[PDB]
Design a protein around this ligand. Sequence first.
Ligand code: NI
Length: 285
Amino acid sequence: GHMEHRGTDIISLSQAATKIHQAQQTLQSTPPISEENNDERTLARQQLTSSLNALAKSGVSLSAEQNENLRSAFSEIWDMVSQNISAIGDSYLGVYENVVAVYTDFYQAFSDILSKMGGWLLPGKDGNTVKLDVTSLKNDLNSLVNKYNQINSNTVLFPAQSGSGVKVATEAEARQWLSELNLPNSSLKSYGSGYVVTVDLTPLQKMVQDIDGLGAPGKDSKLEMDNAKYQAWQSGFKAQEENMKTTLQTLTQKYSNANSLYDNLVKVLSSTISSSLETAKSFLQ
Ligand code: NI
C-alpha cells in the first residue's frame, strides 16, 4: 500500500479524460434529428461508460472529498457512477433523442404541406373575394393525419423503436412519459400487450374541422370566399400551426435540458479526473 505509481495514474486518468471529452463533444455538437445522429450519440455514451469501466479497474485513488462529490452527484465508487450515468443516458436522454428525431420528421411533413398553400389560393371573381382550394388542402391534411395516426417508428415517441417489434410499455410507464412530455391525453395509445406515446394530431384535426366549417365547395372543388372570411379562416389556421410549433418547441427544450442534465454529470466526471491528475503531478515540498 506504500508503493506509489504516479506514472500509471497519469496514463489512466488522461485516457479517461480524453474519452470523456470526446463523448461530451459529440453530445454537445450532434443534434438528435435523425436515426443516424442518434446512433452516433448512443455510441458516444457507450464510449463514455466503457471509459469509466476501465478507470474503475485502474487503481487511481480518490480523496474523501472526490468520493463525496461522486456519491452526492450520482445517487466500487466508479462502478456505481457508471451504472447511474448509463441509466440516465438510456432511460431518459435516449428517450428524448427519440422524441426529437420522430417529431422532427413529422413536423417536416407538415411544413411540406404548408409549402403548397400558395398554390391553393387563387383570384376570386373580383378584388373583394378569393378562391381557396379547400378540397386539395383538406385531402393533404387528412393524408398526414392517416399516416401519423398509425403505430410504427414514424409515429412512436416512447418507447424508442428498433428491429422487428413494436416495443411497448406498461400503461403506468407510458402515462409518466405522457406527463413528462406535456402531451394531450390522445397521444397515449394502446398497442397489443401495452402502451405507446405518439405525436399530437389534434391541431391538424382542428384545421380539417375549421375547413369543413367554411361550407361546401362549389363544382370545381374550391370555395369562393369574401376577403374578410378568408382572413378570419387564415388567422384560425395560423393559430393551429402555432399550436404544433409550441408542442415541438416544448419537446426540443425538454430534450436540451435532459442533455444538459447528462452534461452536468459529465462535468462532474471531468473535474474529478482533473483534480486526480493534479494530485498525480504534484509534489508536496
Ligand atoms: Ni505497500
